[PDB]
Amino acid sequence: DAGYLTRRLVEVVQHIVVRRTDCGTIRGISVSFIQTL
Amino acid sequence: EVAYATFENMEYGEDFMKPDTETYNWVIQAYTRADSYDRVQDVAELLGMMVEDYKRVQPNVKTHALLVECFTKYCVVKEAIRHFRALKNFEGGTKVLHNAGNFEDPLSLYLRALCREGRIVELIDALDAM
Amino acid sequence: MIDRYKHQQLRIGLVSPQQISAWATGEVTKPYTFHYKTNKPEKDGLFCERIFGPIRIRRYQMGYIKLTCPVTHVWYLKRLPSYIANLLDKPLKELEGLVYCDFSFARPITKKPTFLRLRGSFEYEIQSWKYSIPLFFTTQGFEIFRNREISTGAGAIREQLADLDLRIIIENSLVEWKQLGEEDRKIVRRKDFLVRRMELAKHFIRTNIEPEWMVLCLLPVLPPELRPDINELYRRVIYRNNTLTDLLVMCQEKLVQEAVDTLLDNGIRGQPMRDGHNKVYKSFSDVIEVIVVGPSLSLHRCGLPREIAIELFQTFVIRGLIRQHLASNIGVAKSQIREKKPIVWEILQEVMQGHPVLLNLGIQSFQPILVEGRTICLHPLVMAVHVPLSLEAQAEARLLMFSHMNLLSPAIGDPISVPTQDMLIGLYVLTSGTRRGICANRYNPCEPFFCNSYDAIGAYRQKRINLDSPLWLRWQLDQRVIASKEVPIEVHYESFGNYHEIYAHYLIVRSVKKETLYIYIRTTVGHISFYREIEEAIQGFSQAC
């Protein structure tokens, strides 16, 4: 069950590559724990 | 896709590379005159990106002429009417849309599409601009 | 910067009969595979040398079968939802009987004159159409316009597809879609049918794909080298297709159509075709769908046996022999490797140095070294072996995949090579200090001093102290001892100005007259050894680099 999940997880994001320095977005996620920052 | 790759280089680059009004016009024109496949969704998303850049980018006469041409070709007539109204206020106006009769004469197609759909009040207003 | 633009595309599309012919020219016309007597490829057969090439071009040269009757492609008819049925706006039940049942479709075309009031699908046969009409117009004159009033088979479907007005489909679907909007499980279902139909029509208009290509007139044939099951299916299609052209019937067309369905995609009709040994035929749709620990090794190194290394690096050993003129050419260089000439192993060591290999963090890069024996030797913190050939691949292996630039795991950033098991107990025993309290003294109490750490370690080597026996260490650095943040247990204050501060782990001597500050740490040689090992490791690396 772990291998089948890993294959599907890799497949759904296999195309994601860091391609730009800054997309120039304005929005951000508000946070109000240390490891997630 | 060739022109859109260059546009993405500019849109997600540094400040001195950011698209201007002319940059949007070239990429819009590339999709409007594509040889194959449906491109109306690509043009409409580019228009949304241009509108989100209003604080820095504003349209000119070519922007509305290309958008009237695109929406007329795909028979999105109500959107072609919105951009034709904005095209009226620019001097020269309908002549730019005419394109000297090239690219299947977008000026005539706009007039034909209004006639085919019984939008006569809009049709007369188009003739006034001409 | 300007991106290095790279525009590459690939597309799939349905193939015209003309493109099928252009692939082959090449027609396979005989169901023969190989001659029994000569054991040669039969002329004009599935392995014909004039069609596919002499016995490398047989891996890539296509052929084709010229069908006497057109057959529908089973992908676009039976796989639900059907494309042909959706485009023609006819239920698959009433359209499947036109292919596999004894039905006939009236008025298949609309772009040519007709003079009969027949329409739709006729499950029976028209009585007058059998005798009266062929007699009145004569048989020769009847055949000209026969397949314009009522037709049968997959050919009737192709005429409907070829005569479709795709722009009429879009307008009819749109007005019907809006009519249902002005007006419960059928209305929603019918709306989805109309949206799919108008979406399908639009794609045909803006592409070069013709909808009539969904009915096959020619059948492309796989190259022989890719079919050294499929061959039997090909013979079955050829056999029935040759039978049908000899008759020239409808029952024979069904046999040709069914055989092509089996070849293209079996298991779509129900019980699939099976051979004599009770095996279901596979269509094209089915086709497309030792290590030994070495503790002395470095983290970036591995040990390879001679027998394995010489095979992996044979090309480099041959070049090394030729370069240094130990072998005249390629042929001589092989014999020395074959005969285990001792000069081979000297060259093997040279070419292996500086050439990393990939071992399969499941796959990493190590610098191989020749080891005695027959086993692969790996360091305790770690079978396929890959040798990078190009300089681009060798650069990546050394600079990206080595076992020292990947010390942190990407999941949360934890270290990967933390000591475990026997490594961990050794540190635990080493740093487990002296016994304390009632475990150190039988009775309630109502140790050596070392000038430097090297004297303490030297006394331990001479068996003068034990590994966990407490001692005092003269400390000539800053107070960097991790300890409980506690005030002194006792302060001994001499009347001349010097006072001793006794802490749980160290003693500090100070004065109110001088600026002296002397520190003595109560520790063991185990703690000293652990501190020295890390410090000397840092100092040794700095000096060597």
Short mmCIF file of C-alpha atoms in Angstrom, two decimals, chain B residues 1-2 5-6 9 17 34-38 74, chain C residues 1-5 7 9 11 202 206-208:
data_model
loop_
_atom_site.label_atom_id
_atom_site.label_comp_id
_atom_site.label_asym_id
_atom_site.label_seq_id
_atom_site.Cartn_x
_atom_site.Cartn_y
_atom_site.Cartn_z
CA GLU B 1 3.21 29.22 -27.91
CA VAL B 2 6.41 30.85 -29.19
CA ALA B 5 6.99 31.69 -23.83
CA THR B 6 8.59 35.12 -24.24
CA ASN B 9 9.81 35.32 -19.37
CA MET B 17 11.39 43.18 -17.86
CA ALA B 34 -3.41 31.33 -34.69
CA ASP B 35 -3.55 28.83 -37.54
CA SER B 36 -5.33 26.05 -35.63
CA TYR B 37 -7.10 25.09 -32.39
CA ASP B 38 -9.44 27.16 -30.21
CA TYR B 74 -15.31 33.23 -32.11
CA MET C 1 17.83 36.99 -18.25
CA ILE C 2 16.31 35.67 -21.47
CA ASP C 3 15.22 32.05 -21.15
CA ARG C 4 16.85 29.54 -23.47
CA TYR C 5 13.66 28.85 -25.39
CA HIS C 7 9.77 24.58 -28.43
CA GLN C 9 5.73 19.23 -29.47
CA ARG C 11 0.69 15.14 -31.33
CA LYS C 202 -15.92 21.89 -32.80
CA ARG C 206 -10.48 23.33 -36.14
CA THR C 207 -8.29 20.25 -36.76
CA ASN C 208 -7.35 18.17 -39.79
#
